[model samples]
Target: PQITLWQRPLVTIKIGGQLKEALLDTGADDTVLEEMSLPGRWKPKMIGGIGGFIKVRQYDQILIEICGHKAIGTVLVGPTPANIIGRNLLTQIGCTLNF
Candidate 1:
């Protein structure tokens, strides 16, 4: 089967109280946080995954502006395969990923 993908605008997200630019990946189911870039207060929690359960946590809700649209949501705080803009933010704007 053939598949088509859409490239939405990627914006800068504030990390560790500092606003940093990150690529928004819709294919990611969870928002990945950079270990060194994350805030100090955010802690990791034991989480389960396909490979096995691991510790994962993220920063609190943050204010993000995407294509001039702003949203507030908690992002995952931990090392990840990639930084993803997941369903949590997409659902609010009535957007979905097609693959």
Candidate 2:
């Protein structure tokens, strides 16, 4: 579905058998979610942003459904204020800014 940029670009997503809200951030490079549990194992890594960097668990080959479009990509579990659906998954789901 098409969305406007008037407000925060948040949408309902299905991940690991649960429903959650995530922000569709075009400026972000990687998908980051709040601290949570997921199937399989993860790796220790640090991701940097505009403010600084923080350590997070990197889970690869995870399945996430964004607005009914299924996507498999790397998901980072960390202390983010909100769940962000970045370009990593957005690219797979064919998300683009159209006017």
- What's the TM-score of every candidate structure? 0.58, 0.96
Local error of candidate 2 at residue 30 (angstroms): 0.4
Off by over 4 Å in 2: none
Candidates' lDDT values, in order?
Answer: 0.58, 0.94
**Reference-based TM-score, model 2:** 0.96
Q: RMSD, each candidate, Å?
A: 5.1, 0.8
Candidate 1: stretches off by over 4 Å:
1-29, 38-40, 97-99
What's each prediction's clash count? Answer: 2, 0
TM-score of 1: 0.58
